[PDB]
């Protein structure tokens, strides 16, 4: 019906409208936004990369771009815009082909053709890097960290980025070494230089005071029970209608746990991970004092991931109830450490922990939150851009430039294919070049100067060379000191490629009952 036809257009209406202004990308371009939200919420917005994920859109066709935003970042860590902004390039060809009368499936299948032909060329241009040696790890970290928050603190974070993956590095090249193994623990106190890449399982566990599980032969346990006492686990025969009746059961509660925390101290395990599962509430608020009294780190209903970090990395399992002492499935830690930098901050380090050649832990430190932030996010992509190299190596350029190189060279594939799609891929082939034009677009008046030449220049620089948006000027774009790993854009290509044909795979929109 007309509804099937209009909705894909209506999809192309709302969707393609979003993915376009999604390019001011990079640049100091366009006036800053104080965004009153769809609910009326005033929000100061900048830096489209996060403004991508930040964006609140409605309709199925608009949100798939946020879905598209989410896709590239978690994959590579780089090119958050790279996957979305090209959905502007996609729905360029789509309509024109639907305006050419090309069938949605053909326009769909046209996505796969250019994709194969695209991953062809991006790898053809990309210059291979060694993801084992410290070198391109540093370098891909460098340019990424040069595009990250701290350029200055890109220095120490780099080995902490390079050694982190090289901790978890897998033989030669492969898509592996995720960021889940990496546990980024924000440590209040210290500085960004004081950010510390730790080899082992570090926890974000923050418990009372200090000197608490700083000792040696301090194991970190997980308990899927908690300690006993009358009015903890063991029974009370006395009932409280009376504050005096309240006291003798709490006294008997405290007195018994005091014996149990000894049994945790003699366990060799000076960090129990106390189940968030609550028995009576499980580990007593009267007990937390006593476990900490033995220099054992437990905070009420310990953070669940720490329980899983100790499971995953260390291999710890619950033990028998402390009444029975411990089966000592609590993983092997001959040191667990609470570090106060500047005499402040709570960080549980498990040193000598079982680690499976992985779970490298960067401890991102600072006296401020911004300080920890500026570190934390920067090292993250440095972790990522190296994870990118490891996952898929070499380097292309950055800022959309090498895609125009793909665009020139793909029109040649669009020359060869000799199909409807040879035109369809072609209708898309040069639709790629919109990115650096639209990257430079948003800042001002008397508009038209650089835009077509933002395309024309590269084709003038022909098949190897083009303009570098970050440093300006024409060259081979892949190294101006402008790079992203070959992974990032080929990761960017398929996703938007995928998601758009779904719109064509839409016969018509619906609404659930």
């Amino acid at each position: 019906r007309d509804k099937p036809a209009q909705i894909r257009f209506s999809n192309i209406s709302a969707a393609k409208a979003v993915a376009d202004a999604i390019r001011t990308s990079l640049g100091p371009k366009g006036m800053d936004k104080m965004i009153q939200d769809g609910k009326g919420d005033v929000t100061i917005t900048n830096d489209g990369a996060t403004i991508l994920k930040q964006m609140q859109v409605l309709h199925p066709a608009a949100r798939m771009l946020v879905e598209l935003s989410k896709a590239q970042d978690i994959e590579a860590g780089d090119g958050t815009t790279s996957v979305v902004i090209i959905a502007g390039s996609l729905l360029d060809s789509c309509t024109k082909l639907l305006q050419k009368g090309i069938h949605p499936t053909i326009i769909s299948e046209s996505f796969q053709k250019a994709l194969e032909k695209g991953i062809e060329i991006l790898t053809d241009m990309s210059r291979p890097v060694e993801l084992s040696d410290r070198e391109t790890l540093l370098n891909s970290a460098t340019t990424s960290l040069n595009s990250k928050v701290v350029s200055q603190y890109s220095s120490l974070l780099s080995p902490m980025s390079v050694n982190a993956v090289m901790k978890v590095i897998d033989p030669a090249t492969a898509t592996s070494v995720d960021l889940r193994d990496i546990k980024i623990v924000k440590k209040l106190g210290g500085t960004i230089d004081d950010c510390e890449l730790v080899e082992g399982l570090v926890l974000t566990q923050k418990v009372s005071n200090s000197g608490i599980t700083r000792v040696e032969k301090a194991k970190i346990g997980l308990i899927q029970f908690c300690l006993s006492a009358p009015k903890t686990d063991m029974d009370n025969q006395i009932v409280v209608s009376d504050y005096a009746q309240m006291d003798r059961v709490l006294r008997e509660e405290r007195a018994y746990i005091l014996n149990l925390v000894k049994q945790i101290k003699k366990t060799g395990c000076n960090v129990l991970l106390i189940q968030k599962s609550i028995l009576r509430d499980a580990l007593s608020d009267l007990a937390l004092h006593f476990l900490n009294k033995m220099k054992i780190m437990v905070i009420k209903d310990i953070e669940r991931e720490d329980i899983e970090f100790i499971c995953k990395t260390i291999g710890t399992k619950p033990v028998a109830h402390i009444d029975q002492f411990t089966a000592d499935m609590l993983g092997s830690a001959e040191l667990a450490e609470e570090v106060n930098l500047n005499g402040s901050g709570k960080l549980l380090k498990i040193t000598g922990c079982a680690s499976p050649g992985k779970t490298v832990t960067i401890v991102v430190r600072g006296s401020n939150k911004l300080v920890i932030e500026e570190a934390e996010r920067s090292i993250h992509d440095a972790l990522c851009v190296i994870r990118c190299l490891v996952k898929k190596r070499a380097l292309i350029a950055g800022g959309g430039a090498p895609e125009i190189e793909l665009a020139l060279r793909l029109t040649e594939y669009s020359r060869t294919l000799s199909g409807m799609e040879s035109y369809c891929v072609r209708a898309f082939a040069d639709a790629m070049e919109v990115i650096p034009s639209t990257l430079a677009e948003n800042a001002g008046l008397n508009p038209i100067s650089t835009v077509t030449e933002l395309r024309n220049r590269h084709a003038q620089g022909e098949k190897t060379a083009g303009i570098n948006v970050r440093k300006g000027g024409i060259s081979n774009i892949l190294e101006e000191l402008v790079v992203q790993p070959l992974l990032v854009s080929v990761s960017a290509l398929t996703l938007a490629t995928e998601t758009v044909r779904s719109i064509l795979k839409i016969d018509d929109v619906v609404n659930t009952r």
Binding site: K100, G101, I102, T416, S418, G419, M420, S422, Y423
Partner: protein, 73 residues
């Protein structure tokens, strides 16, 4: 289908160029310019090349669109 037909002699350009073959303007079974024996004077097509971009340039020529309220007679 024009899109379909285009794709063929498109694929033919990958095969063959300035060809004695082509589409069938006679709506035949054979798609050629030769088994069709369709043709023009190499003058004509070239003469036909002259005119198209000639008006394209022609709507450009001056900067003057200014009319009494009459740009048509």
């Amino acid at each position: 289908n024009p899109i379909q037909t285009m794709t063929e002699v498109r694929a033919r350009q990958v095969k063959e160029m300035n060809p004695a073959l082509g589409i069938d303007c006679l709506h035949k079974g054979t798609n050629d310019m030769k088994q069709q024996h369709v043709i023009e004077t190499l003058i004509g097509k070239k003469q036909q090349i002259s005119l198209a971009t000639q008006m394209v340039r022609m709507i450009l020529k001056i900067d003057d669109i200014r009319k009494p309220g009459e740009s048509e007679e």
